[PDB]
Every structure is written in C-alpha cells, then in structure tokens.
C-alpha cells in the first residue's frame, strides 16, 4: 500500500461522501433543477475522463 | 430569479469549481487510478439521477 494509493483511495472516499451530501441537497430543489444538476455532474465526469486521456 | 434558483445555480458553480480541482489532483495519480476515479464519479452521477427519479 503506497502513499499515492492511500491518496487515491481517500479521493474516492471524498467523492462518495460528497455525493451523499449532494443527494440530500438536491432533494431540496425542483425536479427540473435536479435533472439539470445531475446532467452537469455526468458531463463533468466525462470531460475529466477525456482530459486525463488527452494529457497522457 | 427566486432564491431557490440562486441556490441551484450556486450548486452548479460549486460542481464546476470542484471538477477543476479534481483535474488538478488526478494529474498526480497513475493512469489506472485516474480511470478508477473518473468511473466512480460517472457512476455516482448516474445513481444520483436515478435516486432523484425514484424519490418522485
């Protein structure tokens, strides 16, 4: 278990935690607003993915 | 422009900001770790989406 591996795992734990907080907050908005936010999260996750592939 | 609309927009601005920070940090991990994190973000965005649809 390298230090960097611990950092990657912490990042994953952070994302899981943040996601649960977002669910709680989204429940406070209207359906269409929830849809807009979820779409943005999805699109941003994919741009990150392509950005990592590009910087290779 | 309702208060709730301002909250939704702030949430979007927060997600954009967090995403840019994640790009910076992912560049510090190995390719396979980057792939693992990006996949988790993508899967979590979709679970959120389905969770919002379910709670309707």
From Swiss-Prot, chains A, B:
Under the heading InterPro entries, the entry gives:
Regulatory_Rop (IPR000769), Rop-like_sf (IPR035962)
> Which GO MF term does the entry hold, naming one?
identical protein binding
Instruction: Extract the signal peptide range.
Output: none
Pfam families from the UniProt entry: Rop
Q: Does the keyword Transcription regulation apply?
A: yes
User: Which SUPFAM superfamilies does the UniProt record give?
Assistant: ROP protein
Q: Which domain of life is it from?
A: Bacteria
Which UniProt keywords are given for this protein, alphabetically ordered?
Plasmid, Transcription, Transcription regulation
- Quaternary context: Antiparallel homodimer.
What this chain does, per the entry, is described as:
Regulates plasmid DNA replication by modulating the initiation of transcription of the primer RNA precursor. Processing of the precursor of the primer, RNAII, is inhibited by hydrogen bonding of RNAII to its complementary sequence in RNAI. ROP increases the affinity of RNAI for RNAII and thus decreases the rate of replication initiation events.
> What name is this protein filed under?
Regulatory protein rop
The source organism is Escherichia coli
Which lineage do the record's taxonomy fields give for this organism? Bacteria, Pseudomonadati, Pseudomonadota, Gammaproteobacteria, Enterobacterales
């Amino acid at each position: 278990m390298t230090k960097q591996e611990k950092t990657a795992l912490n990042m994953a734990r952070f994302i899981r935690s943040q996601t649960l907080t977002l669910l709680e907050k989204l429940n406070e908005l209207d359906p269409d607003e929830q849809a807009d936010i979820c779409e943005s999260l999805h699109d941003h996750a994919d741009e990150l993915y392509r950005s990592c592939l590009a910087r290779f």
